Amino acid sequence: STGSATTTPIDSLDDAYITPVQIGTPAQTLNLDFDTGSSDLWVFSSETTASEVDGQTIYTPSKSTTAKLLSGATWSISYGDGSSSSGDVYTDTVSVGGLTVTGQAVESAKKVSSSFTEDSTIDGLLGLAFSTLNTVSPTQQKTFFDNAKASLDSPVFTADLGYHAPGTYNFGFIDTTAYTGSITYTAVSTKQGFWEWTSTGYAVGSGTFKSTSIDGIADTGTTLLYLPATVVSAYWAQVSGAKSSSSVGGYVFPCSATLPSFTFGVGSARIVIPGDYIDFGPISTGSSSCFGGIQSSAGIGINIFGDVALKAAFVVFNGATTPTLGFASK
Numbered sequence: 001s002t003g004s005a006t007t008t009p010i011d012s013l014d015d016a017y018i019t020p021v022q023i024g025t026p027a028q029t030l031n032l033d034f035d036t037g038s039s040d041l042w043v044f045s046s047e048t049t050a051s052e053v054d055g056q057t058i059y060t061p062s063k064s065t066t067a068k069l070l071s072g073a074t075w076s077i078s079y080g081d082g083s084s085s086s087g088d089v090y091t092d093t094v095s096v097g098g099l100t101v102t103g104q105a106v107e108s109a110k111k112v113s114s115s116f117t118e119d120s121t122i123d124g125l126l127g128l129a130f131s132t133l134n135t136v137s138p139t140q141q142k143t144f145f146d147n148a149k150a151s152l153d154s155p156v157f158t159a160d161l162g163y164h165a166p167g168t169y170n171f172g173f174i175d176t177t178a179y180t181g182s183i184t185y186t187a188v189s190t191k192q193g194f195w196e197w198t199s200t201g202y203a204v205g206s207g208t209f210k211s212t213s214i215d216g217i218a219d220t221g222t223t224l225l226y227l228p229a230t231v232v233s234a235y236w237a238q239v240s241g242a243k244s245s246s247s248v249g250g251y252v253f254p255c256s257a258t259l260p261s262f263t264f265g266v267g268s269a270r271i272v273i274p275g276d277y278i279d280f281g282p283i284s285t286g287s288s289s290c291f292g293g294i295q296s297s298a299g300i301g302i303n304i305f306g307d308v309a310l311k312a313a314f315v316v317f318n319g320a321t322t323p324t325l326g327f328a329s330k
C-alpha cells in the first residue's frame with residue numbers, strides 16, 4: 001500500500017503545516033500537524049474541556065462505528081516549546097492520503113495548553129518519531145507509520161515541505177519526480193527515539209564550508225533551525241545590525257536586510273537554505289525588527305533541523321530495520 005497527502009502551511013510564515021487525516025466511520029476529517037519529533041497521535045475531541053476549544057474541528061468517538069475505548073489508557077505529553085496536552089485513548093480507523101490503518105491509537109485530549117487553544121488551524125498532532133517515545137500508559141502505543149509499515153510497498157515516508165506553498169507527505173514510496181539530483185542517505189540513531197543524525201558541516205552564504213559534526217534531529221514539528229551557538233553566531237555576524245535579544249527570545253535583524261543563505265552538509269552532499277527562508281518577519285506587527293529563522297540550541301539540549309531546514313530538501317525517513325535519513329535538493 002501507499003498514501004499521499006498534501007500538507008499546507010497554517011499561516012504566511014510557514015509556522016507549521018497541516019495535513020488532512022480521516023478518523024473513524026463515517027470519516028471525520030481533522031487537520032493534523034505531522035511531527036517527526038514526537039510519537040503521539042492526539043486530537044481535539046468531544047472530551048476536550050470546552051473553554052480550551054476555540055475553532056478547532058473535534059473528533060467525536062461516539063459518532064464513529066469503529067471507535068473503541070482503550071480501557072484504562074491515558075496519555076500526557078509536554079513539547080520542547082512548553083506546550084502540553086493529555087487525555088484518554090480510543091482505537092479507530094485512521095487514513096492518510098488513501099493509506100488506512102485499523103486499530104490506530106487515537107489519543108483524545110481532555111486538556112490542552114493555551115498555545116493549542118489559540119491555534120484554531122491545528123486539530124491535533126500525528127507523531128512520526130519512533131514509538132519508544134509514545135506517552136500512552138500503561139500500554140505504550142505505536143505510531144501511524146509503525147502500524148502501516150506491515151503493509152507499505154517500502155518502509156518509508158517522505159516529507160516535501162513547501163516554502164510559502166503546499167507540499168506533500170508520502171507513505172510507502174519515493175516520488176523520483178519530486179527532487180533533483182540524487183538522494184544522499186545518512187546514518188540515524190534511535191537511542192533518544194528521534195530521527196537523530198549527524199550533519200557534516202555548514203557554510204554561511206558564499207563562504208567556505210566548515211567541516212564539523214553536528215548531531216541533531218529532523219523535526220517537522222519545529223518551525224526553526226536550532227544549531228550550536230558558534231554556528232549561529234557565525235551566521236548572524238554576516239547580517240548588518242543582527243543581534244541576540246534577551247527580551248524577544250533570540251536573534252533579530254533589521255527587516256531591511258538581505259539574508260545570506262545557509263548550507264548544511266549531508267555526507268558529502270550540501271543542502272542550501274535560501275536567505276529568504278530564514279526570514280520570520282516583524283517581531284510584532286509593524287516593527288522593523290525581524291525574527292531570525294536560525295537560532296541557538298543552547299539550553300534546549302539538542303540541535304533541531306526544523307522546517308526552515310527541511311523545507312529546503314526532499315527528505316526520506318527510511319524506517320527499515322536499520323533506519324536512515326535521505327536528503328535531496330529540489
Ligand SMILES: O=C(O)CCc1nccs1
Nearest residue numbers: 245247248252287288289
Ligand atoms: O524595533 C523594534 O520594535 C524593537 C527593537 C528591539 N529592541 C530590543 C530588542 S528588539
Ligand code: NA
Nearest residue numbers: 249280283291
Ligand atoms: Na515566535
